[PDB]
Nucleic acid binder design. Structure first.
Ligand SMILES: [Mg+2]
Ligand SMILES: [Mg+2]
Ligand SMILES: [Mg+2]
Ligand SMILES: [Mg+2]
Ligand SMILES: [Mg+2]
Ligand SMILES: [Mg+2]
Ligand SMILES: [Mg+2]
Ligand SMILES: [Mg+2]
Length: 260
RNA sequence: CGCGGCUCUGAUUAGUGUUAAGUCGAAAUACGGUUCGUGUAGUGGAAGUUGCACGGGACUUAUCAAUGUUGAACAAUACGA
């Protein structure tokens, strides 16, 4: 069965300094990751996914419509742990290599800050904001910001559930609305018939998530309160998060090829 | 003296044993060229042969017109003689 694993630096015991109280991280990871794994176990208790890993269940249950409920619990457990696994007990100084690509791609580290934080609030819904690394066979490494919805995964092997654009406020009769609507059916029709829209490289090496931001309410509603009056809330939660990012590890997983 | 038993003999007559170098057929052993044998009743130079029922110690010697299957798609980081 799938069991809960400890956190990075005993966050469950002490928690982050000025980002999450030990009681909040307890309700956010222990009392929730355990709840998700209990449901995940019941769904794979007697199937081939019984001994498979979370990410393996994600890629294997991405397109199958009869396993969408299994994808949620598997993808949620993977995304949730991916969030806490990149937090540092003490602020870290951004490396030189990473500090270069961020400025070359987004213009400035402060610009990337507002883009991710701005996307978290602009999304108005529980999800995850990713910092993806895209590198086509001919093009160089390029960093962008991808925002997934409730349990969507950023990996290319699970593009079937790359839930990054709501349909209730993005598909309409307006000029931009019709464009989104066309792309909607173009994906559903292409995916259904098996055709691929964007050619990808083998092994899903195109997109490599490096950083994540969990915007679900169970992670900040208790600590930063609702947010009425401009104090705390989902806004301050995203701001304080930006200070505890493990830029040392973020740069590592990025694997920015040295060319300077 | 009679009857019975026993022994020997008897014109004439039957059977069987032995005997490589004769004669006439070819009945059996192979589907032995009419399946062979048992019983019973006939028949023919001889072995044979005929009827009727019976036995296998003769047919288990037996070896597909059911003609033999798209038994749940494809693609993925799954899969890799
Ligand atoms: Mg005499
Ligand atoms: Mg005869
Ligand atoms: Mg004869
Ligand atoms: Mg005969
Ligand atoms: Mg006879
Ligand atoms: Mg006659
Ligand atoms: Mg015979
Ligand atoms: Mg015989």
């Amino acid at each position: 069965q799938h069991y809960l694993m400890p956190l990075r630096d005993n966050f469950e015991q002490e928690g982050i300094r000025n980002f999450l109280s030990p009681g909040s991280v307890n309700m956010a990871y222990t009392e929730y990751q355990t709840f998700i794994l209990e449901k995940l176990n019941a769904l794979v208790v007697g199937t081939d996914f019984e001994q498979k890993d979370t990410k393996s269940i994600v890629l294997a249950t991405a397109r199958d419509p009869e396993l969408a409920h299994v994808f949620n619990h598997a993808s949620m457990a993977h995304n949730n742990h991916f969030f806490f696994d990149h937090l540092s007990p003490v602020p870290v100084k951004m490396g030189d290599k990473l500090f270069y690509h961020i400025n070359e791609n987004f213009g400035s580290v402060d610009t990337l800050r507002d883009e991710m934080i701005g996307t978290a609030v602009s999304m108005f819904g529980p999800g995850f904001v990713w910092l993806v690394r895209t590198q086509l066979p001919g093009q160089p490494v390029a960093l962008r910001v991808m925002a997934t919805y409730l349990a969507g995964s950023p990996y290319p092997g699970a593009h079937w559930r790359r839930q990054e654009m709501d349909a209730q406020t993005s598909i309409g009769s307006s000029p931009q609305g019709l464009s989104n609507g066309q792309r909607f059916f173009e994906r559903s029709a292409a995916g259904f018939k098996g055709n691929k829209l964007e050619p990808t490289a083998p092994g899903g090496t195109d997109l490599i998530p490096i950083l994540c931001l969990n915007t679900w309410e169970y992670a900040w509603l208790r600590e930063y309160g609702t947010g009425v009056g401009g104090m705390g809330g989902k806004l301050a939660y995203a701001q304080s998060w930006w200070n505890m990012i493990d830029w040392a590890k973020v740069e590592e997983e990025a694997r920015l090829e040295t060319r300077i």
